[PDB]
Symmetry: C5
Subunit: 282 residues, 5 copies
Amino acid sequence: DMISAPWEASLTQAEHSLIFYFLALTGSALLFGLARTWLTRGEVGARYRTAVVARSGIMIVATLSYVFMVLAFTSGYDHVGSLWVPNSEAIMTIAPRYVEWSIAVPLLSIELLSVATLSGVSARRTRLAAVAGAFLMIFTGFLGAVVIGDGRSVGSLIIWGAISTVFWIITAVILIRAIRHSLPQLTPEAAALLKTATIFLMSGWAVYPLAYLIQILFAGGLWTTSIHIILCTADIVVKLGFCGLIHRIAKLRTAEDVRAGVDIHTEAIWISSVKQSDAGIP
Amino acid sequence: DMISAPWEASLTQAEHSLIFYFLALTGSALLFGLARTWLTRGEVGARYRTAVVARSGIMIVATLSYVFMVLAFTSGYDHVGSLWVPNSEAIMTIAPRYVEWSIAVPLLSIELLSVATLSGVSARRTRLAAVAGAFLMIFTGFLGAVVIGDGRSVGSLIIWGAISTVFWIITAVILIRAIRHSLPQLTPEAAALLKTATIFLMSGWAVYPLAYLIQILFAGGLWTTSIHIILCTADIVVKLGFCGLIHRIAKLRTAEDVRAGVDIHTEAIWISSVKQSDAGIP
Amino acid sequence: DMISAPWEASLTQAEHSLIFYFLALTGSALLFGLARTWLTRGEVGARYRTAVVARSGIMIVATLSYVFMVLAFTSGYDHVGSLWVPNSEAIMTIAPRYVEWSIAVPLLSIELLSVATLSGVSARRTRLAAVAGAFLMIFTGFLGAVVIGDGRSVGSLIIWGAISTVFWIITAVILIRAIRHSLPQLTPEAAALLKTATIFLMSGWAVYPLAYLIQILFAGGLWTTSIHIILCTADIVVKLGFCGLIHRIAKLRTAEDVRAGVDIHTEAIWISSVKQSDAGIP
Amino acid sequence: DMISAPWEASLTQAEHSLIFYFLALTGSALLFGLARTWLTRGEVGARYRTAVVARSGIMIVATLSYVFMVLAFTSGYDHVGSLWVPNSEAIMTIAPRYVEWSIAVPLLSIELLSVATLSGVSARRTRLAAVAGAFLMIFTGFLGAVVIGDGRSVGSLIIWGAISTVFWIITAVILIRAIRHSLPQLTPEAAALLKTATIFLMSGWAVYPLAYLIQILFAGGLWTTSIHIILCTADIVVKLGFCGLIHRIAKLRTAEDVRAGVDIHTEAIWISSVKQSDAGIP
Amino acid sequence: DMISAPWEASLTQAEHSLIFYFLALTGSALLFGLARTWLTRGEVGARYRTAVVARSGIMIVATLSYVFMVLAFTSGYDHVGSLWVPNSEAIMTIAPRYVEWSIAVPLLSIELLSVATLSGVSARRTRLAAVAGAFLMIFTGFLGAVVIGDGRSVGSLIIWGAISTVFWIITAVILIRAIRHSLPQLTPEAAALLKTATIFLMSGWAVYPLAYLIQILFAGGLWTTSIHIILCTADIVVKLGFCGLIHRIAKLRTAEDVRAGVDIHTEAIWISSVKQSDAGIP
Ligand SMILES: *C/C=C(C)/C=C/C=C(C)/C=C/C1=C(C)CCCC1(C)C
Ligand SMILES: *C/C=C(C)/C=C/C=C(C)/C=C/C1=C(C)CCCC1(C)C
Ligand SMILES: *C/C=C(C)/C=C/C=C(C)/C=C/C1=C(C)CCCC1(C)C
Ligand SMILES: *C/C=C(C)/C=C/C=C(C)/C=C/C1=C(C)CCCC1(C)C
Ligand SMILES: *C/C=C(C)/C=C/C=C(C)/C=C/C1=C(C)CCCC1(C)C
């Protein structure tokens, strides 16, 4: 059976207005996040800088995606009477997310493993399996949602969607295994935070499959609005929220190492206005 | 009853000229503010860096909003005689402010609490209640002013406006309570400044509801000009003005801590060409 | 009586070619000054960083104004024969300067007072009176030149121009008074430079009123070219020239303080390949 | 004989959707790479900074190329039915790669020699022969593929392609000779990595000639898609992958020198979460 | 006699393709150069930082010029049949170079004098005479080539070209005199390099007059291609090549001063993988 695609829906001006709000709010919040990332990048040790690098990629790629999308929104719908009607650049208000997620979902996995206690080359097996699994999960979604059937085929959404769901299970079982190994070998205070950051990431990722069910089941401008709102909201929460949580863990670990002799940090580490470690000279 | 919207008004060339001035002046002043923020970002301790991060978000989001708005101004009105007549991209000379305020008003609240003396459960509870309350106040305005009724419904402005006014009261009672707790536990010199910064922020926020009354009551190009002038002016005063006042407080607090042993700062802190603290090595 | 406006003149191709060269040479030279400002910003102390901040805004706002004016030149005139004929975006090749000057003229005043010896009530009173007076002088020009008769009214140029000339006198009497107070309390070497920088600024500001007399008196593409050449040239001289002169004074003062114990600088200060002060550690 | 060019093919919507994905994915991944480069640029000694500089050029040039290409994609094909028919700006979705490769392939050669053990004069002969040979190999490809015959001449692809293949052999024999000389004079641990980085670079370069065989042999939108996919994929692997491998070698060498007295590094060097060297003060 | 101008020639697709290559290659190489400049800016003493500042201006102005030119190329010629036919914005593919050279040729002169041994105020006489002479040489070219006659007048090319050639002689006699004075007072090793850098700059400048002879003598798309190729190539060689040679001299001089007590540098200086100087603390 055939279903209209999400970018083949005429939008009212309450729908058009919300969609521009959330697209522009999401791009804004991720440019804040990018700035924050840069300003706070020296609170973390060089042992834990992979976390900073990940997060900077996540924020750059996502900010660009959202600019593209906001500019395609302006040039993707033509107002006819009281309703905005999609043209051929309307697909460019939706498709560009898959490019963002293609980089970000792998980088979120890398950021999480950044602050775990895996080292050397068994680390590398886990980082690669994660980056693969993550990338394959998005790309197989892209194919169902955008490429094969042109977004308009229920069977192609269900097949490529199911396949994507398998790489979700594989990626999540790799990460959750990595973290379960680490928690014993961290300090109690960090292990606590790393458990929570793992629950926050996996939980965030469960929201995104729901946008894909809408596309299968419901078509309309209401629902095209629902999709954008859901996905925009989830990007803000899961990319501001989670990337601030890993940074606390990096800082706390950095400080723990300072206190222990493992290394020396130029500034002091203050987490929650509690000094974790003092500044030091080589 | 129905009222024409603000972006649905034909502008004379004196009105068009003023509107471009102020939009372009505001974006300019906030790019200065962004630069200033970066250049002075190392005058503050790591204990107080949340203040720098907030202010940088406030300036980035706002600068972008104002670029969008200035570019939409050029492509949103067509000169047809002695009048500039609005296109369908003239909503985009007004609506993008709500996106800015959605990030900024929460970040201004965070910046203010940055330099207060709050820690524990109560700190995080207070930061979240503030960020929520602030965000909800803007968004409920957006809905009245832009989305529901299309800006052209008096009942939708009065209902969504009243609702927004409740989240104003809730947000302001949270912040004013937080600050009232802190002033005892600061030093006299900082407590003085934190009282003043609180009065300057709350007072600034009372200006923005007046732009919203115009939209309810008066329609015309005079009044569309009045709205932009009011809102542009208020952004300059309350974003340049207030974010420079919190930076003095962060600096003064940073220095107070240096002097006290709590921490060490690489450079000396000068506050009104008065040296507050000397430079130090770990 | 009526006069055509400067942006209502048909330019030849010699006139059109010289106006793009000067408009693009001014944005190019003010992007070199933005780079010079950032590369040479740690040669000055933290007692005199209010000068690095003022100059960075004077060069960021000015480069953004000249990019817009060069982009609106490409889309503001149409070649209809051997003549470039103005559109409705031709006002945007002239008007954007008033936005630049609105930020810059106040910031130039701040930069000059940066390196003077004012502190107390008198300092803040002086900085505010200057920033006000400067801003009011430009804005009252904008109204005469762009807004009130559409640039086409001789009485509106002479009235708003006279008013602007009063805020010039007020602003210049404030600054010259501030500097006259400082010169006694500086060192001979700096006092000398601060006198010269004051003469260079006031003298630079006297050029800009001449562009405004042309607009009153003469209309033509020759004269529209004369205006742009005059104003572009003056921006280069007074914004490259003067902002390099204050930086020497900041450096010399920084070094004088180093030598005196007042503070310590990480690098040495070399002014004219002559070493003023050595590097030092806290 | 004549062959249609790759930019003269009508793409289906699945072929346009893939092509936009990969172009946008590649530009995204190279902006991550650029960020990474900047954030990690102080892990390396000043003796080995040429490696950082190379890699930064590689990432900047390539990111820009890919932006151009993504913007030309939007404005290079027009949807006329179920097909995206090529405009005259569809050559600009392919040609800009040759500009990227013209800078990058020489810079990749420089980056590889960066971490080898060459003197500083006989170094120069090798660096120049490499940069020449590399540049000549791309440019002679450009001429066959784009300029002479207009991409549509089989004899011009085979002649200019063969010529390009000779500068490949010359460039690769210079580099492989340089590295074979160095491996003895490195430490075992670095020599190992430098062998692998050499195999990874030469192997990466063998993929790009296959895109050029497609252009000779096969024409279609399938094949225009195959070309972009191949070339995009190879850019990600060989520019993210290889430029991270040289950075490990620079770091390991930097640390080896620290440990040996040759120099001192401000931070510690952690590679695979193993401290290679401690931080130190002059 | 009247000669067609260089932007009044219909380009083939081979000539259009080359022109886009070289414009895009030159802008690319100068963005690399800009990056390089920033990454290596701390290898030089503060005594010699004028060299860094010059070079950064040279790279910024030139990169922007080349972006403008590449964007004007896309929108300056229309494909009509088998030929690209110039529109009225084809002059913007050639004219913008004069703006670049107007800043750069003066800054190249400043960079060269940066590392010579002139100090105080007799330095200033030489720096001003140079910057004047250089600026006047370009501007008088612009007038012959672009403004007077519209590029189409042989007598205006020969008169304004001859005049430009006089300011070349004056500028070169000032610089060569300055350098001849310095070589005695440098160290043998630096004097050697400063002689070579002087020969490389003067020699580079002799290439640019040849583009101007073509414009006088030959008109055609072959020749419009020859002009762009010549000028693009010369920009790459003389702006990458020369600005890397002055940086070696600054570094070598910086190190010589370190070794001598004149100053202290934070990093070590390595030139050709030979440690020139060690890192030091105040
Ligand atoms: C910052 C962006 C993030 C974390 C994006 C996450 C996206 C997913 C986890 C998507 C998962 C999907 C499935 C498992 C099934 C249906 C298709 C997808 C791609 C939406
Ligand atoms: C920098 C921007 C700031 C501080 C913006 C502030 C905006 C408000 C405080 C808006 C308040 C409103 C009401 C309380 C009622 C009417 C609707 C609003 C959104 C204008
Ligand atoms: C960098 C820009 C500067 C210093 C601009 C200065 C502008 C003025 C000093 C303008 C003065 C004017 C008058 C006093 C009378 C006529 C109108 C003005 C605005 C041109
Ligand atoms: C990051 C980009 C890289 C490494 C690009 C590499 C490109 C080549 C090595 C191309 C080689 C070619 C031949 C040797 C023959 C056919 C033509 C070329 C240009 C594709
Ligand atoms: C990086 C750019 C540089 C060094 C440009 C240099 C340009 C010249 C030296 C031009 C010289 C000319 C003459 C002396 C005569 C003919 C006209 C000119 C402008 C081409």
